[PDB]
Amino acid sequence: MRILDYDKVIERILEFIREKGNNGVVIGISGGVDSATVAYLATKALGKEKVLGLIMPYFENKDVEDAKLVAEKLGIGYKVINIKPIVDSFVENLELNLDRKGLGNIMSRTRMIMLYAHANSLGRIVLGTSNRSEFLTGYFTKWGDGASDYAPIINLYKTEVWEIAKRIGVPERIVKKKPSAGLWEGQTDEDELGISYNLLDEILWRMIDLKIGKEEIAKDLGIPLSLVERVEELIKKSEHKRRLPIGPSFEDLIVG
Amino acid sequence: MRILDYDKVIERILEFIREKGNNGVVIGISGGVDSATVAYLATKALGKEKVLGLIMPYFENKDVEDAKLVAEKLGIGYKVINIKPIVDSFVENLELNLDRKGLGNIMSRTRMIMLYAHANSLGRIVLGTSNRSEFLTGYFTKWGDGASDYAPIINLYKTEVWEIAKRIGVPERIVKKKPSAGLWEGQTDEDELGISYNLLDEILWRMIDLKIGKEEIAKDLGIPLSLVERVEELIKKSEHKRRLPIGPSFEDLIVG
Ligand SMILES: [Zn+2]
Ligand SMILES: [Zn+2]
Ligand SMILES: [Zn+2]
Ligand SMILES: [Zn+2]
Ligand SMILES: [Zn+2]
Ligand SMILES: [Zn+2]
């Protein structure tokens, strides 16, 4: 995988957060490693008084315990907000069936509204916790979690996020935890993507950053071309998630 | 001002819609001219059985009346969803003060969630109703109504939308009604932007499309260079609304 000079990378992230969130920030803390890493970097960069964490569970599971652990060890201000009543109200108003992915989308978008409502009230910005691995594969809710003012680790692959998390003191059981967006019980990132993040990042790195042909990738890693075509598919089918709403142009229709 | 070939613009928009939303569409109808125009274009392009209109009032005013009329004339399926209970619940969880714009943003984002919940359930796409005038001045809610799968008129200035609204047969009182985002009683676009759309568009077109200096612009018009800077102001401060969440880059830190 590409090699980064973490010492310098971490430094640049901290400087970036200092420059963008001097007036304080609001972050969604879920108990996963991405939001915890952003929570740690933001705290070290601005100091705990400038970091408000919102823990917004839908399910009452151990994930909440992990998030509070992050909040606790950092000493930041935080708030636990049960979003199930609001989420279910969206569903009751829908009056139609909705699969688990659609329901997960409501949860994530509901968290987005909560984050922005708090940031707006406090004159703060919202720090998103998405990473490049999710960004390139479309593994995120459009307009939901992820949607923020600034995203400190959007340009870092998952593998790198884990390395940085360990280096900054993020709880080990969190760093080692199996990745899960937590939209429904039993949801597992690698099972949904059908590949580990380690193997994914190796492909994205070569396919997007290096622009290395599908064939060179498969062999230059001893992996089935299928696995490579798969990844390339996730990227193509999620291109609509990496751009603002588009419409028709009318340049050749201008008159004079 | 720019001169467009309306008959052809409409034709292109209809083709765009027939291409992007063959499986049906969900549109937020608010009783304003933009959403009305998109509703008319979508209906004429796909047939009324492929257009679902969600009317989502927070206030109980005339606004809801115009929304229903648009839905009635088109014969499309429609659903009236009172969003106040959900919006007020967000506020209750907030437990902090929120000015009218912040509250207006909760409304807009709540409608976005409703729109995608129906779209997701019915396997349809969401058509945004923002226009270029709003887009360039940042006069919309981030992740709110400014969030959809496709925005058919986003590249048309407000003045051009009005013209198109008349040609496709949008109700006259709506086409003539004074522009308002309706996020708070008494709200007026022109009154809030400190300029009429007609003048605004003249400037935008010249300042952004033609890339003409504000100096000559103030000249070719007859308006104080201060009003011309006021627009340049609105544009620069809304740059954060015309892009996806960004984070720091690390190209120079990659050890290759
Ligand atoms: Zn490697
Ligand atoms: Zn109903
Ligand atoms: Zn994540
Ligand atoms: Zn793994
Ligand atoms: Zn509009
Ligand atoms: Zn006017």
For residue A189, the one-letter residue type is D
Say if residues A54 and A111 touch (Cβ distance below 8 Å). yes
B128 reaches A (C-beta below 8 A):
yes
CA dihedral A15, B246, A42, A159 (to 10 degrees): -100
Q: Are B152 and A248 in contact (CB < 8 Å)?
A: yes
Q: Hey, how many other C-beta atoms are within 10 angstroms of the C-beta on A7?
A: 9
CA distance B179 to B177: 6
Q: Which of A104, A149, A87 is nearest to B110 (CA)?
A: A87
CA distance B80 to A95: 12
Closest in B121, B243, B248 to A12, CB measured: B248
CA distances from B136 to A200, B13, B133, B201 (A): 37, 20, 5, 10
B210 reaches A (C-beta below 8 A):
no
Phi-psi region of B142 (alpha: psi -120 to 50; beta: other; left: phi over 0): beta
Phi, psi for A236 (deg, rounded to 5)? -70, -45
Q: Which of A28, A78, A54, A123 is nearest to B98 (CA)?
A: A123
Closest in A12, A106, A249 to B250, CB measured: A12
Q: Which of residues 87-106 of A touch B (CB under 8 A)?
A: 89-91, 93-94, 96-99, 101-102, 105-106
Say if residues A122 and B94 touch (Cβ distance below 8 Å). no
Task: Give me the residues paired with residue B246 across strands.
Answer: A150
Q: Which residues surround ligand 6, an ion (CB under 5 A)?
A: B 196
Q: Which of residues 10-39 of A touch B (CB under 8 A)?
A: 12-13, 15-16
For residue B203, the one-letter residue type is I
The secondary structure element, H or E, covering residue B78 is: strand B77-80
Alpha helices in A123-185 (DSSP H): 132-137, 158-168, 172-175
Q: Are B143 and A245 in contact (CB < 8 Å)?
A: no
For chain A, the first-to-last Cα distance in angstroms comes to 55
Closest in A13, A113, A149 to B240, CB measured: A149
Distance from CA of B161 to the nearest CA of A (A): 13
Task: Give me the residues paired with residue B126 across strands.
Answer: B26
CA distance B18 to B21: 6
Q: Which long-range contacts (CB under 8 A, 24 or more apart) does B181-189 make?
A: B181/B104, B181/B139, B181/B140, B182/B30, B182/B31, B182/B32, B182/B59, B182/B63, B183/B100, B183/B101, B183/B103, B183/B104, B183/B105, B183/B107, B183/B108, B183/B141, B184/B100, B184/B101, B184/B103, B184/B104, B185/B59, B185/B61, B187/B104, B189/B139
Question: Closest-CA residue in chain A for B242?
Answer: A244
The secondary structure element, H or E, covering residue A103 is: helix A100-122
PDB experimental method = X-ray
Phi-psi region of B81 (alpha: psi -120 to 50; beta: other; left: phi over 0): beta
Write out chain B residues lying below 8 Å of A99, CB-based: 120
Q: Name the token pair of B71.
A: 């839905």
Q: Are B86 and A85 in contact (CB < 8 Å)?
A: no
CA distances from B99 to A116, A118, B139, B167 (A): 13, 12, 17, 39
- 3-state SS assignment for residue A254: strand
Say if residues A193 and A48 touch (Cβ distance below 8 Å). no
Say if residues A24 and A123 touch (Cβ distance below 8 Å). yes
Phi, psi for A205 (deg, rounded to 5)? -55, -50
CB pairs under 8 A between A and B: 184
Phi, psi for A42 (deg, rounded to 5)? -65, -40
Q: Domains along chain A?
A: 1-256 (3.40.50.620)
Phi, psi for A67 (deg, rounded to 5)? -60, -45
For residue B240, the one-letter residue type is H
Q: Hey, how many other C-beta atoms are within 10 angstroms of the C-beta on B192?
A: 15
A199 reaches B (C-beta below 8 A):
no
Q: Name the token pair of A223.
A: 């992996």
Say if residues A201 and A179 touch (Cβ distance below 8 Å). no
B161 reaches A (C-beta below 8 A):
no
CA distance B224 to B186: 28
Q: Which of B30, B136, B10, B36 is nearest to B80 (CA)?
A: B30
A205 Cβ neighbours under 8 A, 6+ residues apart: A1, A2, A157
CA distance B153 to B156: 5
Mutation for testing the B interface, residue in A20, A250, A255 having most B CBs under 10 Å: A250
CB hemisphere CA count around B154 (13 angstroms): 24
Say if residues B141 and B109 touch (Cβ distance below 8 Å). yes
Q: Which of B30, B57, B59 is nearest to B177 (CA)?
A: B30
The secondary structure element, H or E, covering residue A68 is: helix A63-74
B125-127: strand order across its sheet:
B77-80, B51-55, B25-28, B125-127
CA distance A228 to B121: 31
For chain B, the first-to-last Cα distance in angstroms comes to 52
